[PDB]
């Protein structure tokens, strides 16, 4: 029984997923997908400086 | 019998564990957990800011 505890311990410290920072990766991550989808969206408009010098 | 009497006493102060003080130690980790747990998730809201700007 003492075994089988510190070896259930010694493997979740290797498979088993943090939430403390994998919660804080998600929210940089869709932080970032906004701000691209705006920069990409306002990249698209660029060759319309043509349009006025024609 | 005498002997062991003392002795006992003798490992007892060593030994076990004083319920009064761990009590205490206990819910005061308590309170720390919910105030980390909610400074934590107010921290990861902080990168929305860029939003704002953007």
Same mark, same amino acid.
């Given at each position: !029984?003492?075994? $089988? *505890? =510190?070896?259930?311990?010694?493997? /979740?410290?290797?498979?088993?997923?943090?939430?403390?920072?994998?919660? /804080? @990766?998600?929210?940089?991550? @869709?932080?970032?997908?906004?701000?691209? /989808? !705006?920069?990409? *969206? $306002? *990249? =698209? @408009?660029?060759? $319309?400086? *043509?349009?006025?010098?024609?």
């Amino acid at each position: !029984a003492n075994t $089988q *505890a =510190n070896v259930a311990d010694a493997k /979740s410290r290797i498979v088993d997923v943090d939430f403390a920072k994998e919660t /804080s @990766q998600m929210t940089k991550n @869709q932080v970032l997908q906004q701000t691209g /989808s !705006a920069m990409l *969206a $306002q *990249a =698209n @408009q660029l060759p $319309q400086v *043509a349009l006025s010098l024609l």
